[PDB]
Ligand binder design. Structure first.
Ligand SMILES: CCCCCCCCCCCCCC(=O)O[C@@H](CO)COC(=O)CCCCCCCC
Ligand SMILES: CCCCCCCCCCCCCC(=O)O[C@@H](CO)COC(=O)CCCCCCCC
Ligand SMILES: CCCCCCCCCCCCCC(=O)O[C@@H](CO)COC(=O)CCCCCCCC
Ligand SMILES: CCCCCCCCCCCCCC(=O)O[C@@H](CO)COC(=O)CCCCCCCC
Ligand SMILES: CCCCCCCCCO
Ligand SMILES: CCCCCCCCCO
Ligand SMILES: CCCCCCCCCO
Ligand SMILES: CCCCCCCCCO
Ligand SMILES: [K+]
Ligand SMILES: [K+]
Ligand SMILES: [K+]
Ligand SMILES: [K+]
Lengths: 106, 103, 103, 103, 103, 106
C-alpha cells in the first residue's frame, strides 16, 4: 500500500502570506493525488483533484502542483477561513490511501 | 449490402461495446487486489484500446485472474475485428481486379 | 467442411496446445536464472497469451536463451493462427461476394 | 493502375502524413501535463512509428486525454495501412494463381 | 511453384537476413550512446525478433537515431513478411474453395 | 517535477586545471540534460546539449558526460573567461526545470 507522508503536521503562517502543504508518496503515482479540507466538526471537502485540477466552488486562492512522489498544495494569501486540517489521498494503486494530515495555524 | 462491409461495421460496433464492457469489468475485477493499477474507468478505457490494438505501452495491465480473462476477451475481439477489416479490404480489391480483368 | 474453417479450428486447438506447452517449458527454462520472473505456471500462461497475441505489456518476459526460443515459438504460433483466421474470413467474404454477383 | 497497389501507395503516404501530424499534435497535447514524456518532436516521431506499427516498447506514451486520442488515431491508421498492404498482396497472389490455373 | 508459397519462403529467408543485419547494425548504432542497452549481439538478436513480431516486451530498445532507423526497417520487414504469409494462406484457401465449388 | 541538484554551489580552481561541475537529477532522465553559462550581467548561453553534444562556437575546452541521474560538465584547463555561473536544465519530463547553479572561481 502507498504511504502518503504529510510533514510538517502543523503549519503556522501570518495572514496574507503564501503557504504550502507537502505530500510525499512512497512510490511514484503520476498525478493521482487529491486534496481535501476538513474544518472543525465538519466533513472533508475536495479542494484539488489530480494534483492540480481546480474544483468548482473552491476559491482561486487554492492551487496544487507536483507529480511522481512529491506534491504541494498552495494557498496564496491565507485567511481565517482556511484554518483546518488538510489531507492528501492517492488513487494510483489499490487500495486508496490518505495522508496523515497537516493542520493550518494562523 | 455486401457482406464484408456489413460485417466490418458490425465488428466495429461490437468492438466499441467490448471496449466499454471491458473497461467496466476490468475495474470491477482489479479493485481489491493490492497494487493493482487498472482501477479507474477512464484509464481502463485507455487500457482497453491499448489491448484491442495490441499497442500495449505497459503503463496499465491487469494483475488478477478475472482481469486477465477480461483482457484476453478484449485482445481477441480487437485482433479479430481488425483482421476482419483486412479481409473485407481484400475482398473489395479482389472484386475490383476481377472486374478490371473483364471477368 | 470448407478447408478454411477446418484449418481455423485446427489452428485454434494447436494454439491452445502451444500456450500450455509454452507455459510449462518457459517455467522449465527460466528457473535457475537469477532475476527471472517467468517462473510460476499461472503467470507463465498469462505471459504465453500476451506473447501469442503480441499484446506484450512487459510485466513478464524470458531472460534465458531457451526461454526466448520458447517465446519465439509462441510468437510465431499466435501470429500465424490469427493470420489464418483472417485468411479464412477473407475466403468466406470472397465466396459470398462471388455468389452475390451471380458468378 | 490496379486498385490495390494504388490504395497501398495512398495508404503509405497517408500514414506518413499521420505520423508527422501525430507527432506535432502529441507534443501539443502532452506539454502542460506534469510528468509527461512525449514532449519533444523527435522522440514524438519515434513514438508515432512505435504506435503505428504496434511495436510499443513502452519508452514513451501519452498521459493526457487528447494525447491518447491522437494515439488512437495513429494506431488505427497504422493498423489499417498495414492490413491494406496485406490485402493488396493477397489480391496479387489470387490473380497470379488464377492465371497459373489458366482461368 | 505457386507464387504465394515461393514469396512466403523468400520473405522468410529475407526476414532472417534482416534480423541478423539488424542485430549487427543496432549494436553498431547504439554503442557510444550513454545509457544504451542494445549493445551486445545476443540480446540484440532477441530484440530484433521482438521488433519483427511486434511482441515488444520493453526490455530492450534503441535510443539513437540510427538505432531507431534500423528498428523501423526491422518492424516493416517483420510486419510485411507475416502479412505476406497471411496473404498466401488466403490465396490457398480461395483456390481450395473454388475447387470445392467445382468452379 | 524533476529536481536538479548542483552541489557544490561554488567551485574554486587554479588556472589551467581541469574542473567538473555536478548535476544530479531526482529521477532518471536519460541524457536529456543541457548546460548553460551565464557571465556577470549577461544572458544564459548554451554550452552543451543532451549531456555531451558539442555546440557550434563553444571552445573545445568544454565537454559533458553522464546519463541517468548523474551528469558532469567539464572544463579542461580553466581560464579567466570561464568565470561565470553554470546551470543545468532537463527536458525529459514536463515541465522543464533548472539546476540552482554553480559559480566558477579561479
Ligand atoms: C503443467 C501445465 C502448465 C501450463 C499452465 C498451467 C495452468 C495454470 C492455470 C492458469 C489459471 C489458474 C491459475 C490460478 O490458480 O489463479 C491465480 C494463481 O495464483 C492467479 O490467476 C492468474 O494469474 C491469471 C490467470 C491467467 C489468465 C489468462 C489465461 C488464458 C486462458
Ligand atoms: C555479427 C552478427 C550478429 C547477429 C546476431 C549475433 C548472433 C548471436 C547468437 C544468438 C544466440 C547465441 C547467444 C548466446 O551465446 O547465448 C547467451 C548469450 O550470452 C544468451 O542467449 C540469449 O540471450 C537468447 C538467444 C536469443 C533467442 C532468440 C533468437 C531467435 C532465433
Ligand atoms: C461504466 C462504463 C465505463 C466504461 C468507460 C468509462 C468512460 C470514461 C470516459 C473516458 C474518457 C473521459 C475520461 C475523462 O474524464 O478524462 C480524464 C479523466 O480524468 C483523462 O482522460 C484520459 O485519461 C484519456 C481518455 C482515453 C482516450 C482513449 C479512449 C478511446 C475512445
Ligand atoms: C512540426 C513537425 C514535427 C513532426 C516530427 C518532427 C521531425 C523531427 C525529425 C525527426 C528526426 C530528426 C531528429 C534529430 O534531430 O535527431 C536527434 C534529436 O535530437 C535524435 O534522433 C532520434 O531521436 C531518432 C529519430 C527517429 C527515427 C524514427 C523516425 C521514422 C522515420
Ligand atoms: C469474463 C468477465 C467476468 C466478469 C469479471 C467479474 C469480476 C469479479 C471478480 O471477483
Ligand atoms: C524449444 C523448447 C526447448 C525446451 C526447453 C528446455 C529447457 C532446458 C533449459 O536448460
Ligand atoms: C484529434 C487531435 C486533437 C488535437 C489536440 C489538441 C491539443 C490541445 C489539448 O489541450
Ligand atoms: C540503415 C542502417 C544504417 C547503418 C547504421 C550505422 C550506424 C552508425 C551510427 O553512427
Ligand atoms: K509492448
Ligand atoms: K515497461
Ligand atoms: K496483424
Ligand atoms: K503488437
Amino acid at each position: 500500500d502507498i504511504l502518503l507522508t504529510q510533514s510538517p503536521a502543523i503549519l503556522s503562517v501570518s495572514p496574507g502570506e503564501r503557504v504550502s502543504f507537502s505530500c510525499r508518496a512512497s512510490q511514484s503515482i503520476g498525478t493521482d493525488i487529491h486534496w481535501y479540507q476538513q474544518r472543525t466538526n465538519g466533513s472533508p471537502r475536495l479542494l484539488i483533484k489530480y494534483a492540480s485540477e481546480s474544483i468548482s466552488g473552491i476559491p482561486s486562492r487554492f492551487s496544487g502542483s507536483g507529480s511522481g512522489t512529491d506534491f504541494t498544495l498552495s494557498i496564496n494569501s491565507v485567511e481565517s477561513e482556511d484554518i483546518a486540517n488538510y489531507y492528501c489521498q492517492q488513487s494510483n494503486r489499490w487500495p486508496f490511501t490518505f495522508g496523515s494530515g497537516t493542520k493550518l495555524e494562523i | 449490402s455486401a457482406l464484408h462491409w456489413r460485417a466490418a461495421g458490425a465488428a466495429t460496433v461490437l468492438l466499441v461495446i467490448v471496449l466499454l464492457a471491458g473497461s467496466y469489468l476490468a475495474v470491477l475485477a482489479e479493485r481489491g487486489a493490492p497494487g493493482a493499477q487498472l482501477i479507474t474507468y477512464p484509464r481502463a478505457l485507455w487500457w482497453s484500446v491499448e489491448t484491442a490494438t495490441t499497442v500495449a505501452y505497459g503503463d496499465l495491465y491487469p494483475v488478477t485472474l478475472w482481469g486477465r480473462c477480461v483482457a484476453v476477451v478484449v485482445m481477441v475481439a480487437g485482433i479479430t475485428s481488425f483482421g476482419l477489416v483486412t479481409a473485407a479490404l481484400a475482398t473489395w480489391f479482389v472484386g475490383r481486379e476481377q472486374e478490371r480483368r473483364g471477368h
